[PDB]
């Protein structure tokens, strides 16, 4: 029934069938023997691995409903516990997703785009203060993407030097490092034993509990100040839907799903976006001619006075292609987020029993040599046709595909476009390291780029 793969040991599974270069290189090596679809054992748990564009498309698109289940991540499950939009399943997920999708479509008063532009203006104002001083951009890029989520859920942004904000930021971004760490990957395989002993899991738990506590306080603060005729944000809207469903005891719109849906938005909405911006500017230091062409396109379509608007992207295929290529080569979620099959499901030769975990290895699509001339080399041409127009690419699935496709895709892409262009419109860039010496190779389950310094040199 199950797809082929290495014979598992009891308890340990295919632990010893790796890892060498890494978990990605193992899967790549495993793939080269067993094919594009294979079974691997994480401890005693069987997982089906989907490799290559065709197989991932065939599962997530052509059988969308079967492959619409969400798998657990062991280090954060004790916080989420199947609540919230990311880790919910079945009807719960369906309802939270529908509500969330519909809600963020409107904001609040001012739109998400307008908030991103404002954030972009705040960023520029801030960068301008350094006067070309060296800086690591990690914090500011974590801040700007968190502020967009804060704007959406709390109806406001925080100042960049606010200690309340900075403390939460530090809390958040320690958690991501720990979640991705090798120790948490060991915890994934053997949580049942390891949950009784000290480890990264305890620290992840406390960090996320602190964040949840802050969110709970905001919720109470929102309720206490609520104008039901004028919702300010996601929480107000959710609070109003809570009231409407007050009678229905089969309603998913209760307190627990509120707290953890908000946590979910921060969990999925900050790290990947920030790192994408950080990785992007690393590439822009390594390839100044690209950066130069982007600025020329900014100057031609937008000019030097008004700020970029999302409308501009349609007229800026080169920049848009650069952003596509940044996301592709960046490959920030190489294994995807874990799925499960919602029923005994027929896939190629095989039957995947109900609730079996499935990893869609986005990386193998993003590096698919069918769709990309130069998979391992930065090449904006990958997304440009012979007329210099943006071209769609079947391999390009950084946000995944199907019913679980990134709920924030449009928000993510808008941030990417407006931040990159608003920054480059106002600043050129430099750093101590010669372009030729800049190393793009990442630092376990994460694909995190190395730290670096950059200058933002005001223009005009
Ligand atoms: C460059 C930035 C981002 C990238 C590359 C990205 C990518 C992804 C990927 C690969 C998934 C897994 C989908 C699956 O299960 O197959 C996902 C899920 C998700 N993302 Fe994003 N994301 C980004 C930013 C955001 C933002 C800004 C938001 C919200 C504003 C967001 C919200 C979510 C949510 C809620 C899910 C869970 C969807 C569900 O289970 O229904 N993400 N994202
Ligand atoms: C020799 C010892 C080897 C130990 C090897 C352990 C292997 C275990 O590795 C498998 C780990 O699971 C890989 C899939 O995890 C993906 C988790 O991604 C977390 C991303 O969370 C943020 C979600 O939002 C991102 C998009 O918005």
Structure, described:
- The chain has 460 residues and is α+β, with helices and mostly antiparallel strands.
- The protein has one domain (1-460): Cytochrome p450 (Orthogonal Bundle), CATH 1.10.630.
- It contains 16 helices and 9 strands.
- The protein has helices at 23-34, 53-60, 77-80, 90-104, 112-129, 138-154, 163-180, 182-194, 200-224, 234-244, 255-269, 271-286, 288-301, 317-330, 362-366, 409-426; strands at residues 37-42, 45-50, 69-70, 339-340, 345-347, 350-352, 357-360, 427-430, 455-458.
- The strands form 3 sheets. The protein has a 5-stranded mixed beta sheet with strand order 1-2-7-4-3. It has a two-stranded antiparallel ribbon with strand order 5-6. The chain has a two-stranded antiparallel sheet with strand order 8-9.
- Helix 6 (138-154) runs antiparallel to helix 12 (271-286).
- The longest helix is centred in the middle third of the chain and has 25 residues, at 200-224.
- The termini are far apart.
Would you spell out the secondary-structure blueprint of this structure?
Blueprint: H1 23-34, E1 37-42, E2 45-50, H2 53-60, E3 69-70, H3 77-80, H4 90-104, H5 112-129, H6 138-154, H7 163-180, H8 182-194, H9 200-224, H10 234-244, H11 255-269, H12 271-286, H13 288-301, H14 317-330, E4 339-340, E5 345-347, E6 350-352, E7 357-360, H15 362-366, H16 409-426, E8 427-430, E9 455-458
Parallel strand pairs: 2-7
Antiparallel strand pairs: 1-2, 3-4, 4-7, 5-6, 8-9
Helix pairs in contact: 5-6, 5-16, 6-7, 6-11, 6-12, 7-9, 9-11, 12-13, 12-14, 12-16
The chain binds protoporphyrin IX containing FE and 3,6,9,12,15,18-hexaoxahexacosan-1-ol.
PDB class: oxidoreductase
Keywords: cytochrome P450 2B4, monooxygenase, oxidoreductase
Assembly: monomeric
């Amino acid at each position: 029934k199950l797809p082929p793969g290495p014979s598992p040991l009891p308890v340990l599974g295919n632990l010893l069938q790796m890892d060498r270069k890494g978990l990605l290189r193992s899967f790549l090596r495993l793939r080269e023997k067993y094919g594009d679809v294979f079974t691997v054992y994480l401890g005693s748990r069987p997982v089906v691995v989907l490799c290559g564009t065709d197989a991932i498309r065939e599962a997530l698109v052509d059988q969308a409903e079967a492959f619409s289940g969400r798998g657990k991540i062991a280090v954060v499950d004790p916080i989420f516990q199947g609540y919230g939009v990311i880790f919910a399943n079945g009807e719960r997920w369906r309802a939270l997703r529908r509500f969330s999708l519909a809600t963020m479509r409107d904001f609040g008063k001012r739109s998400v785009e307008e908030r991103i532009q404002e954030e972009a203006r705040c960023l520029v104002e801030e960068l301008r203060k350094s006067k070309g001083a060296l800086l690591d951009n990690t914090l500011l890029f974590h801040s700007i993407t968190s502020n967009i989520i804060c704007s959406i859920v709390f109806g406001k942004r925080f100042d960049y030097k606010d200690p309340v904000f900075l403390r939460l930021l530090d809390l958040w971004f320690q958690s991501f490092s720990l979640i991705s760490s090798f120790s948490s990957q060991v915890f994934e395989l053997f949580s049942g034993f390891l949950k009784y002993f000290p480890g990264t899991h305890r620290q992840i738990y406390r960090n996320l509990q602190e964040i949840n506590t802050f969110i709970g306080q905001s919720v109470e603060k929102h309720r206490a100040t609520l104008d039901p005729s004028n919702p300010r944000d996601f929480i107000d809207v959710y609070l109003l839907r809570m009231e409407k469903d007050k009678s229905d005891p089969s309603s998913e719109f209760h307190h627990q799903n509120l707290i953890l849906t908000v946590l979910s938005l921060f969990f999925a909405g900050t790290e990947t976006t920030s790192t994408t911006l950080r990785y992007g500017f690393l590439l822009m230091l390594k390839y100044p001619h690209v950066t130069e062409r982007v600025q020329k396109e900014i100057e031609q379509v937008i000019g030097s006075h008004r700020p970029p608007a999302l409308d501009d992207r349609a007229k800026m295929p080169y920049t848009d292609a650069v952003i596509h290529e940044i996301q592709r080569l960046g490959d920030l979620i190489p294994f995807g987020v874990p799925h499960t099959v919602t029923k005994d499901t027929q896939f190629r030769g095989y039957v995947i029993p109900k609730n079996t975990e499935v990893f869609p290895v986005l990386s193998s699509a993003l590096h698919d040599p069918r769709y990309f001339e130069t998979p391992n080399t930065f090449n904006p041409g990958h997304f440009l046709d012979a007329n210099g127009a943006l071209k769609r690419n079947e391999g390009f699935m950084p946000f995944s595909l199907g019913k679980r496709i990134c709920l924030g895709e449009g928000i993510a892409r808008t941030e990417l476009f407006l931040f990159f262009t608003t920054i480059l419109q106002n600043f050129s860039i430099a750093s101590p390291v010669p372009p030729e010496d800049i190393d793009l190779t990442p630092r376990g389950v994460g694909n995190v780029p190395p730290s670096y310094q950059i200058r933002f040199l005001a223009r005009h």
